[PDB]
């Protein structure tokens, strides 16, 4: 492991086929700066104040993805069409800040060992699905070339309210729920 | 005026639940030590989970990491060798000095601190802070505890804040004062929280 004060990933690219699924991000010290929406051709900053002084031309993401489409084709053939292995992801749920009755908070679902980078993370309150107040990060790179990902649910902590983080992935026979209560 | 973030160029080679898939990845990594005094550039080309080709500026050229990349390294060294070398300055150094210095490295998020009880154990919750460097200390009637002290790993929230939990092994007596004491770059003086038996 290389010793450094800081690490920028100024170019993280992934592409897979079939399905034409791809992602381009920048990170600094392990946090996402932005991803380029490759279909809308625009830069989407993790926090909106990142882009108030700084610009990233989406074309750089387009450059990387086109090169990776090409590289995927060549290396697939050179490997004698060795397919990727579907991993089984694993999830941990924890609160953003200490849980206090009636005080708005955020429940965080951290999901690791994601490969290939295609997944569903959804939330359940009292076994009923919740779509409001949900944000999800990009696929963030791991040293072993798998990925991790976080989903965020805004909630008001109450008495015996019950949450599950539900993960579905090709490497899972059935969706895994990760439970959580105060 | 707006400043531009630059990127490391992905060089190109020459020329579903049960469906097979095939994955490729490119990673452009800039390692900084003491600002931009030491920079190290490492770019990686990966098929599925196998990194096969790497540029490492401590080496100075592309090298095959595995046999799959034996001929890739010879092509990339012919086509992109000195372009990639120059990226150490045109991309890594520029991005640090012109874009990280005014943003990522000026970010300061002060921790929040709360004590609660779980012999017994006090839990000091230190949350919502950035950057990662922090020191947490426990004291008992004005004297620092060092034995009986454990913490979780640093938790990365993904939203550019961290948290950590720091636990004290303790038996409550008398009217003692336990204090959780937090030092952090966002804080000119420590934040403290007192808990009384
Ligand atoms: C993520 O969720 C979507 C929606 O639930 C899945 O897509 C559906 O998959 C079912 C499974 O049999 C199909 O019958 C539907 O036709 C699909 N609907 C839509 C709208 O896509 C998707 O497969 C999930 N992904 C993973 C990896 O499990
Ligand atoms: C290529 O892969 C096929 C499919 O598994 C295998 O049967 C064969 O041995 C391989 N052939 C060569 C020439 O590598």
Curated annotation (Swiss-Prot), chain A:
Disulfide bridges in this chain: 109-165
Membrane recorded as keyword: yes
Subcellular location: Membrane
Membrane topology qualifier: Single-pass type I membrane protein
Positions of the UniProt region annotated as Alpha-1: 1-86
A cellular-component GO term for this protein: MHC class II protein complex
GO biological process, one term: antigen processing and presentation of peptide antigen
Region named Alpha-2: 87-180
Membrane topology (Extracellular): 1-182
Superkingdom field: Eukaryota
Keyword DNA damage: no
Glycan attachment positions: 120
Family, similarity comment: Belongs to the MHC class II family.
Protein name: H-2 class II histocompatibility antigen, A-D alpha chain
Organism: Mus musculus
UniProt gene name: H2-Aa
Residue span relative to the full protein: 26 to 207 of 256
């Amino acid at each position: 492991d290389i010793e450094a004060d800081h690490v920028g990933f100024y170019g993280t690219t992934v592409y897979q086929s079939p399905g034409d699924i791809g992602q381009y991000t920048h990170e600094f010290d392990g946090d996402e700066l932005f991803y380029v929406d490759l279909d809308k051709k625009k830069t989407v900053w993790r926090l909106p104040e990142f882009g108030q002084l700084i610009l990233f031309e989406p074309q750089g993401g387009l450059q990387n993805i086109a090169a990776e489409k090409h590289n995927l084709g060549i290396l697939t053939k050179r490997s004698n069409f060795t397919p990727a292995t579907n991993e089984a992801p694993q999830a941990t749920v924890f609160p953003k800040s200490p849980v206090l009755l009636g005080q708005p908070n955020t429940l965080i679902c951290f999901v690791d060992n994601i490969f290939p980078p295609v997944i569903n993370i959804t939330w359940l309150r009292n076994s009923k699905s919740v779509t409001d107040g949900v944000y999800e990060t990009s696929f963030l790179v791991n040293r072993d070339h798998s990925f991790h990902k976080l989903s965020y649910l805004t909630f008001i902590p109450s008495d015996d309210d019950i949450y599950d983080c539900k993960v579905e992935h090709w490497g899972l026979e059935e969706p895994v729920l990760k439970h959580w209560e105060p | 005026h707006l400043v531009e973030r630059l990127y490391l160029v992905c060089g190109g080679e020459g020329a579903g639940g049960s469906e097979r898939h095939f994955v490729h990845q490119f990673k452009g990594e800039c390692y900084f030590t003491n600002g931009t005094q030491r920079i190290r550039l490492v770019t990686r080309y990966i098929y599925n989970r196998e990194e096969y080709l790497r540029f490492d500026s401590d080496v100075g050229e592309y090298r095959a990491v595995t046999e799959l990349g034996r001929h890739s390294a010879e092509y990339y060294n012919k086509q992109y060798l000195e372009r990639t070398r120059a990226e150490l300055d045109t991309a890594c150094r520029h991005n640090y000095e012109e874009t990280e210095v005014p943003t990522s490295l000026r970010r300061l998020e002060q921790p929040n601190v709360a004590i609660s009880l779980s012999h017994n154990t006090l839990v000091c919750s230190v949350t919502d802070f950035y950057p990662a460097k922090i020191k947490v200390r426990w004291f008992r009637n004005g004297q620092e505890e060092t034995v009986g002290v454990s913490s979780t790993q640093l938790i990365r929230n993904g939203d550019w804040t961290f948290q950590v939990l720091v636990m004290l092994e303790m038996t409550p007596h008398q009217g003692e004062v336990y204090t959780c004491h937090v030092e952090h770059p966002s804080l000119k003086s420590p934040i403290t929280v007192e808990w009384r038996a």
